[PDB]
Coordinates of C-alpha atoms in Angstrom, one line a residue:
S1 CA 0.0 0.0 0.0
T2 CA 0.9 3.7 -0.2
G3 CA -0.5 7.0 0.9
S4 CA 0.0 10.6 -0.4
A5 CA -1.3 13.8 1.4
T6 CA -0.8 17.5 0.8
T7 CA 0.6 19.5 3.6
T8 CA -0.1 23.2 3.9
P9 CA 1.6 26.0 5.8
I10 CA -0.6 27.4 8.6
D11 CA 0.4 31.0 8.0
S12 CA 2.5 33.3 5.8
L13 CA 5.7 32.5 7.6
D14 CA 5.5 28.7 7.3
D15 CA 5.5 28.5 11.1
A16 CA 4.1 24.9 10.8
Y17 CA 2.4 22.7 8.3
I18 CA -1.0 20.9 8.6
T19 CA -2.0 17.7 6.8
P20 CA -5.6 16.3 6.7
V21 CA -6.1 13.0 8.5
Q22 CA -9.3 10.9 8.6
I23 CA -10.1 9.4 12.0
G24 CA -13.0 7.0 12.9
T25 CA -16.1 5.8 11.2
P26 CA -17.7 7.8 9.6
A27 CA -14.5 9.7 9.0
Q28 CA -13.8 12.8 11.1
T29 CA -11.2 14.9 9.3
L30 CA -8.7 16.8 11.5
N31 CA -5.7 18.9 10.3
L32 CA -2.7 17.5 12.1
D33 CA 0.9 18.7 12.5
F34 CA 3.1 15.8 11.3
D35 CA 6.1 15.8 13.7
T36 CA 9.2 13.7 13.0
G37 CA 10.5 14.9 16.4
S38 CA 7.8 13.2 18.5
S39 CA 5.9 9.9 18.6
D40 CA 2.4 10.6 19.9
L41 CA -0.7 11.0 17.7
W42 CA -2.9 13.3 19.8
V43 CA -6.0 15.3 18.9
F44 CA -8.3 18.0 20.3
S45 CA -11.4 16.1 21.3
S46 CA -14.9 16.2 22.9
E47 CA -12.9 15.5 26.1
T48 CA -10.7 18.6 25.9
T49 CA -11.4 21.2 28.6
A50 CA -13.8 23.5 26.9
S51 CA -12.0 26.7 27.8
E52 CA -8.9 25.3 26.1
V53 CA -10.6 24.9 22.7
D54 CA -10.7 27.9 20.5
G55 CA -11.6 27.1 16.9
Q56 CA -10.0 23.7 16.5
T57 CA -11.8 20.8 14.9
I58 CA -12.4 18.1 17.6
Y59 CA -12.5 14.3 17.4
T60 CA -15.6 12.9 19.1
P61 CA -15.0 9.1 19.8
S62 CA -18.6 8.5 20.8
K63 CA -19.6 9.3 17.2
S64 CA -17.1 6.7 15.7
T65 CA -18.4 3.1 15.4
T66 CA -14.8 1.9 15.3
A67 CA -13.5 3.8 18.4
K68 CA -12.6 1.8 21.5
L69 CA -11.3 3.1 24.8
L70 CA -7.8 1.8 25.5
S71 CA -8.6 1.0 29.1
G72 CA -6.3 2.5 31.7
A73 CA -4.1 4.2 29.2
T74 CA -3.0 7.8 29.7
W75 CA -0.5 10.1 28.0
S76 CA 1.3 13.3 28.8
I77 CA 3.9 15.1 26.7
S78 CA 6.0 18.2 26.9
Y79 CA 7.7 19.7 23.8
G80 CA 10.9 21.6 23.4
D81 CA 9.1 24.9 23.1
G82 CA 7.5 24.4 26.6
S83 CA 4.1 23.5 25.3
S84 CA 2.3 20.4 26.6
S85 CA -0.9 18.2 26.5
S86 CA -2.3 15.1 28.1
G87 CA -5.3 12.9 28.2
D88 CA -6.6 9.3 27.6
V89 CA -6.4 7.0 24.7
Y90 CA -8.7 5.4 22.1
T91 CA -7.9 3.0 19.3
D92 CA -9.6 3.8 16.0
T93 CA -9.1 3.7 12.2
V94 CA -6.8 6.4 10.9
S95 CA -6.2 7.2 7.2
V96 CA -3.6 9.5 5.7
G97 CA -3.8 10.2 2.0
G98 CA -5.5 6.9 1.2
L99 CA -3.4 4.8 3.5
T100 CA -5.4 3.2 6.3
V101 CA -4.3 1.8 9.7
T102 CA -6.8 0.0 11.9
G103 CA -6.3 0.0 15.7
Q104 CA -4.2 3.1 15.8
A105 CA -3.7 4.7 19.2
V106 CA -5.5 8.1 19.0
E107 CA -4.6 10.1 22.1
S108 CA -7.5 12.3 23.2
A109 CA -6.5 15.5 24.9
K110 CA -8.1 16.4 28.1
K111 CA -5.8 19.3 28.7
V112 CA -3.6 21.4 26.3
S113 CA -1.3 24.3 27.0
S114 CA -2.0 27.8 26.0
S115 CA 0.0 27.8 22.8
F116 CA -2.1 24.9 21.4
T117 CA -5.3 26.7 22.4
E118 CA -4.1 29.9 20.7
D119 CA -3.4 28.1 17.4
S120 CA -6.8 27.5 15.8
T121 CA -5.3 25.9 12.7
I122 CA -3.7 22.8 14.4
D123 CA -6.1 20.1 15.6
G124 CA -3.4 17.9 17.0
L125 CA -0.1 16.2 16.2
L126 CA 0.9 13.1 14.3
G127 CA 4.3 11.8 15.6
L128 CA 6.7 10.2 13.2
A129 CA 9.8 9.7 15.4
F130 CA 10.6 6.3 16.8
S131 CA 7.9 4.6 18.9
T132 CA 10.3 4.3 21.9
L133 CA 9.4 8.0 22.5
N134 CA 5.7 7.4 22.7
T135 CA 4.3 8.6 26.1
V136 CA 1.3 6.3 26.5
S137 CA 1.4 4.5 29.9
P138 CA 1.3 1.8 31.1
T139 CA 1.5 0.2 27.6
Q140 CA 3.6 2.3 25.1
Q141 CA 1.9 2.6 21.7
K142 CA 3.2 2.6 18.1
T143 CA 3.3 5.5 15.7
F144 CA 1.1 5.6 12.6
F145 CA 4.2 4.8 10.4
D146 CA 5.3 1.9 12.7
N147 CA 1.8 0.4 12.4
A148 CA 1.6 0.9 8.6
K149 CA 5.2 -0.1 7.8
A150 CA 4.6 -3.8 7.1
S151 CA 1.8 -3.1 4.7
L152 CA 3.7 -0.4 2.7
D153 CA 5.3 -1.1 -0.6
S154 CA 8.6 0.1 0.8
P155 CA 9.1 1.0 4.5
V156 CA 9.6 4.7 4.0
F157 CA 7.9 8.0 4.2
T158 CA 9.0 11.3 2.6
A159 CA 8.7 15.0 3.5
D160 CA 8.5 17.5 0.7
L161 CA 7.7 20.8 2.5
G162 CA 7.0 23.9 0.5
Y163 CA 8.4 27.4 0.9
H164 CA 5.3 29.6 1.2
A165 CA 3.4 26.9 -0.6
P166 CA 1.9 23.5 -0.1
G167 CA 3.9 20.3 -0.2
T168 CA 3.5 16.6 0.2
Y169 CA 3.9 13.7 2.7
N170 CA 4.2 10.3 0.9
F171 CA 4.1 6.9 2.6
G172 CA 5.5 3.7 1.1
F173 CA 7.1 5.1 -2.1
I174 CA 9.7 7.6 -3.3
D175 CA 8.3 10.0 -6.0
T176 CA 11.2 10.2 -8.4
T177 CA 9.6 13.3 -10.1
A178 CA 9.7 15.3 -6.8
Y179 CA 13.4 16.0 -6.7
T180 CA 16.4 16.8 -8.8
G181 CA 19.7 14.9 -9.0
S182 CA 20.2 11.9 -6.7
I183 CA 19.2 11.2 -3.1
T184 CA 22.2 11.1 -0.7
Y185 CA 21.6 8.7 2.2
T186 CA 23.2 9.1 5.6
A187 CA 23.3 7.1 8.8
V188 CA 20.8 7.5 11.6
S189 CA 21.1 6.8 15.3
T190 CA 17.9 5.8 17.0
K191 CA 19.5 5.9 20.5
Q192 CA 17.5 9.0 21.6
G193 CA 14.4 8.1 19.6
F194 CA 14.9 10.7 16.9
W195 CA 15.9 10.7 13.2
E196 CA 19.4 11.7 14.4
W197 CA 22.2 12.1 11.9
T198 CA 25.5 13.9 11.3
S199 CA 25.9 16.7 8.8
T200 CA 29.3 17.0 7.3
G201 CA 29.6 20.8 7.5
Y202 CA 28.3 24.2 6.3
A203 CA 28.8 27.2 4.2
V204 CA 27.5 30.8 4.5
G205 CA 26.4 32.4 1.2
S206 CA 29.1 32.1 -1.4
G207 CA 31.8 31.3 1.3
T208 CA 34.0 28.2 1.4
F209 CA 32.6 25.0 2.9
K210 CA 33.7 24.2 6.4
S211 CA 34.0 20.5 7.0
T212 CA 32.8 19.7 10.5
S213 CA 30.5 17.1 12.0
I214 CA 27.2 18.5 13.2
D215 CA 25.0 15.9 15.0
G216 CA 21.3 16.8 14.9
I217 CA 17.7 15.7 14.3
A218 CA 15.5 16.0 11.3
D219 CA 12.4 17.5 12.9
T220 CA 9.4 18.6 10.8
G221 CA 7.7 19.8 14.0
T222 CA 10.3 22.5 14.7
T223 CA 10.0 25.7 12.6
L224 CA 13.6 26.9 12.6
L225 CA 17.2 25.6 12.2
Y226 CA 19.0 25.3 15.5
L227 CA 22.8 24.9 15.2
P228 CA 25.9 25.4 17.4
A229 CA 26.7 28.9 18.5
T230 CA 29.9 29.1 16.5
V231 CA 28.0 28.2 13.2
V232 CA 25.2 30.6 13.9
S233 CA 27.6 33.5 14.8
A234 CA 29.4 32.9 11.5
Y235 CA 26.1 33.1 9.6
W236 CA 24.8 36.3 11.2
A237 CA 28.2 38.1 11.0
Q238 CA 27.5 38.3 7.3
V239 CA 24.3 40.3 7.8
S240 CA 24.8 44.0 8.5
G241 CA 23.1 45.0 11.7
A242 CA 22.2 41.5 12.9
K243 CA 22.6 40.8 16.6
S244 CA 21.6 38.3 19.3
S245 CA 18.8 39.9 21.4
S246 CA 18.3 38.4 24.9
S247 CA 15.0 40.4 25.1
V248 CA 13.6 39.0 21.9
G249 CA 15.1 35.5 22.4
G250 CA 17.6 35.1 19.5
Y251 CA 19.1 36.7 16.5
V252 CA 17.3 39.6 14.9
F253 CA 18.3 41.5 11.8
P254 CA 17.1 44.6 9.9
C255 CA 14.1 43.8 7.9
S256 CA 15.7 45.8 5.0
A257 CA 18.5 43.2 4.7
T258 CA 19.0 40.7 2.0
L259 CA 20.0 37.4 3.7
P260 CA 22.7 35.1 2.4
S261 CA 22.0 31.5 1.8
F262 CA 23.1 28.7 4.1
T263 CA 24.5 25.4 2.9
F264 CA 24.6 22.2 4.9
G265 CA 26.4 19.0 4.0
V266 CA 24.9 15.5 3.6
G267 CA 27.9 13.3 3.0
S268 CA 29.6 14.7 0.0
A269 CA 26.3 16.4 -1.2
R270 CA 25.1 19.9 -0.3
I271 CA 21.7 21.3 0.4
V272 CA 21.3 25.1 -0.1
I273 CA 18.8 27.0 2.0
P274 CA 18.0 30.3 0.1
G275 CA 18.4 33.4 2.1
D276 CA 14.6 34.2 1.9
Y277 CA 13.8 31.0 3.8
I278 CA 15.7 32.4 6.8
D279 CA 13.4 35.5 7.1
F280 CA 10.7 35.1 9.8
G281 CA 9.5 38.7 9.5
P282 CA 9.0 41.5 12.0
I283 CA 9.4 40.6 15.7
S284 CA 6.2 42.4 16.4
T285 CA 3.6 43.8 14.0
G286 CA 5.1 46.9 12.2
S287 CA 8.6 46.5 13.6
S288 CA 11.6 46.9 11.3
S289 CA 13.5 44.3 13.3
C290 CA 13.1 40.8 11.8
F291 CA 13.5 37.4 13.4
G292 CA 16.1 35.1 12.1
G293 CA 15.4 31.5 10.9
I294 CA 18.8 30.2 12.1
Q295 CA 19.3 30.2 15.8
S296 CA 21.7 28.8 18.4
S297 CA 21.0 25.4 19.9
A298 CA 23.3 26.2 22.9
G299 CA 20.3 26.2 25.3
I300 CA 18.6 23.1 23.8
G301 CA 21.1 20.3 24.2
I302 CA 20.6 19.1 20.6
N303 CA 20.9 20.6 17.1
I304 CA 17.6 20.7 15.2
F305 CA 17.2 20.6 11.4
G306 CA 13.7 22.0 11.5
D307 CA 11.5 23.2 8.7
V308 CA 13.9 26.0 7.5
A309 CA 16.4 23.3 6.5
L310 CA 14.0 20.5 5.6
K311 CA 11.9 22.5 3.2
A312 CA 15.0 23.1 1.0
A313 CA 15.2 19.4 0.4
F314 CA 13.2 16.3 -0.6
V315 CA 13.7 14.2 2.6
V316 CA 13.4 10.3 2.8
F317 CA 12.8 8.8 6.3
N318 CA 13.8 5.2 5.6
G319 CA 12.4 2.9 8.2
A320 CA 14.2 -0.2 7.1
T321 CA 15.6 -2.6 9.7
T322 CA 18.6 -0.2 9.9
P323 CA 17.0 3.2 9.4
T324 CA 18.6 5.9 7.3
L325 CA 17.9 9.5 6.1
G326 CA 18.0 10.6 2.5
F327 CA 18.3 14.2 1.2
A328 CA 17.9 15.5 -2.4
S329 CA 17.7 18.9 -3.8
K330 CA 14.5 19.9 -5.5

């Protein structure tokens, strides 16, 4: 089997991407944030505290003839941005782009933190990291990809995120028309539960490539590119007037600037992030100070190849017995 679904930016900055997902019988379609940095599929629901719902579409398990309470199971998750959610668990039928999994754990939110409430466009998350990170207790549950894997034509999914435009998540096949050149594959460590890999270096604009190993994660659920302070300083030093602002929370730059590109290495191959992808616009409405799309990871504990980096590539998440990541230009 295969599946193919369009993913759409939630706003004009590409802060996140939503993909329609069918849950239950008859189908209830929710727009979920596919997140290769986490491993829970959770949704706003008829159980979510009413004051914490503000415009989201909710899953109502009582209206699904295939929903079943997973007795005794609870979940609770906290994300790197400080947001969180928790609740109980149903199993139900879940379909993405024509690919159907029966018995998928659908984690129903009883509580969500303010940032979820305040984002009316995201109805939940669909985790695509390794199932060892799933938070369901006392019986850990499998991701949608893990459950579908055996049925797929090939045990892979791909992320093809657009810049200011829709893109595609494919399951079970590699669309050879969706990228240019060849796909370069690189080793993955699953020891932390992430799609963790080592980039071979970087370049700033037209500068020379610096060969240096950068361990980090491919994370579709993180907006920006978080890299070591040395790398980030070298990038922003090429932008007149850019500075790190403790009050804003990272590097800012004059909105009048033209940003240089940023290149990262994948083995001997190179992925070029155009300068425009690094512009996240005014820090506040009407400001001439703009927020940078490349930020320091020094306070995180891990480097994160988020959407800024991934949307410059066609990315293969290869879930074979020994997982690997593939990157191509497009």
